[PDB]
Amino acid sequence: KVFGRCELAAAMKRHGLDNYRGYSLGNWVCAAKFESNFNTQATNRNTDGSTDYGILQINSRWWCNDGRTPGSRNLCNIPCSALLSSDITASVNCAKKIVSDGNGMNAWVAWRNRCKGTDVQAWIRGCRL
Ligand SMILES: [Cl-]
Ligand SMILES: [Cl-]
Ligand SMILES: [Cl-]
Ligand code: NA
Ligand code: NA
Structure with missing residues (x-):
C-alpha cells in the first residue's frame, strides 16, 4: 500500500507512535517518507x-x-x-x-539525514488527527 501522508500519520498515531520514546509523530512520518516513500512494499x-x-x-x-x-x-x-x-x-x-534500543531514531539513516533537526511537524500539518 502507498499511504497518503495524513493517512499514515493517523495510522501511526492510532498505533501509539506519537511521542513514543519522545519522538513526535512528524518524526515518524518524515522517516517513513524518506525511507519508503510511504510504500509498505x-x-x-x-x-x-x-x-x-x-x-x-x-x-x-x-x-x-x-x-x-x-x-x-x-x-x-x-x-x-x-x-x-x-x-x-x-x-x-x-x-x-x-x-x-538506545539509539533512538538514529537507527533510520534517512531520519538522521533528512528529518532530524528539521521542522518535522510540517509532516502532519493539515492532517485531521
Ligand atoms: Cl510532529
Ligand atoms: Cl536469515
Ligand atoms: Cl532518543
Ligand atoms: Na517497515
Ligand atoms: Na536479505
Whole structure:
C-alpha cells in the first residue's frame, strides 16, 4: 500500500507512535517518507546482503527473518514479509523495539539525514488527527 501522508500519520498515531520514546509523530512520518516513500512494499538490499523492508525499512540483519541473511538476528521475531503488509502494525511494533534500543531514531539513516533537526511537524500539518 502507498499511504497518503495524513493517512499514515493517523495510522501511526492510532498505533501509539506519537511521542513514543519522545519522538513526535512528524518524526515518524518524515522517516517513513524518506525511507519508503510511504510504500509498505518497499524493499532495498544492503551491501552486507541484508535487506530493508517496509514503510520503515527495517533491516533483516537484526530485526526480522528473511531466510537469506546468514548470521542475522530476528529481534522483532517476525518474518520480514510481515513488514510489507498494508497493515502497519508489525512495522510499528518492530519500530518501537528499534527506537527503544538506545539509539533512538538514529537507527533510520534517512531520519538522521533528512528529518532530524528539521521542522518535522510540517509532516502532519493539515492532517485531521
Ligand atoms: Cl510532529
Ligand atoms: Cl536469515
Ligand atoms: Cl532518543
Ligand atoms: Na536479505
Ligand atoms: Na517497515
